[PDB]
Design a protein around this nucleic acid. Structure first.
Ligand SMILES: [Zn+2]
Length: 273
DNA sequence: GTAGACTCGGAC
DNA sequence: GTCCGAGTCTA
């Protein structure tokens, strides 16, 4: 899940937990808890607090409690669900927050890559991982000017640049390949090789791509759904991601797949320069 | 500052 | 064996 996915999860999860008081916190896979490092302390400090709100920062969910903030990252396959405490638990449930009303917030993650950090509300923003996060793509803090700034200070590919959460928040593998194709730029291009026109173009497309995505509930390509288990629909609007060997939707040239910045990369050798 | 290797487990 | 909507730790 990237910005669009997490944003949908956020909007649909809030009403299901807002105003509930944590009665217990059960942990079946301690490694997910990053801070405090001792899982017993993590659990003990949550008890008695009420869920006041749910915010997003890049791909992170920020649960606002009374004095604390629970920072959660789903990474590759983490997922939330609110259900009854009387029902058996589905497989791969690693952390459960029990509310005083008998319902509970369950966190599932087949790969166990997800993380959880709990800090006093005022410390959350000045501590990792929210600490070195770049600006929100959909906000003025993210402008062509800002992007140009980081591009020159490096020889690495533009794809590696965009995947860097310190440059811009929330862009992942799918939307990077998709924005580069829309901007007509090869992902392997050195970040510096880009020009002023190419930079403002990329910015334009990043904002539109990410934008259309949230408005469609995200991209379900394998295991993503909102807290209601509903599937997004932006994956029907994908130009390159996951379409290797298939004709480009614009020019008909077969989409190619390579490894760039250590990850699967899709692009149209004809339309992207 | 930056290329790699985990952290893990189920679907082809 | 290969593939994977992520991002911190290495060397
Ligand atoms: Zn094309």
């Amino acid at each position: 899940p990237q910005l669009p996915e997490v944003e949908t999860i956020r909007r649909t999860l809030l009403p299901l937990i807002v105003g509930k008081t944590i009665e217990d916190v059960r942990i079946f896979w301690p490694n997910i808890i990053r801070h405090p490092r001792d899982s017993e302390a993590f659990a003990a400090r949550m008890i008695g607090q009420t869920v006041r709100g749910l915010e997003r920062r890049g791909k992170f969910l920020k649960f606002l409690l009374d004095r604390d903030a629970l920072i959660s990252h789903l990474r590759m396959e983490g997922r939330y669900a609110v259900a009854s405490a009387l029902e058996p638990l589905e497989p791969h449930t690693h952390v459960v927050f029990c509310f005083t009303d008998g319902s509970e917030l369950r966190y599932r993650d087949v790969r166990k890559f997800g993380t959880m950090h709990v800090y006093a509300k005022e410390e959350a923003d000045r501590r990792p991982p929210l600490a070195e996060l770049g600006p929100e793509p959909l906000s003025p803090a993210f402008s062509p000017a800002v992007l140009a700034e980081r591009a020159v200070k490096t020889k690495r590919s533009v794809k590696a640049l965009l995947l860097d959460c310190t440059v811009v928040a929330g862009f992942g593998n799918i939307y990077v390949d998709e924005s580069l194709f829309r901007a007509g730029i090869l992902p392997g291009r050195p970040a510096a090789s880009l020009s002023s026109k190419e930079i403002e173009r990329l910015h334009e497309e990043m904002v539109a791509t990410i934008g259309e995505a949230v408005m469609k509930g995200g991209s379900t390509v394998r295991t993503y759904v909102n807290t209601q288990g509903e599937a997004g629909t932006f994956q029907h609007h994908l130009y390159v991601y996951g379409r290797q060997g298939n004709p480009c939707k614009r020019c008909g040239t077969p989409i190619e797949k390579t490894v760039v910045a250590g990850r699967g990369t899709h692009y149209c050798p004809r339309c992207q320069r």
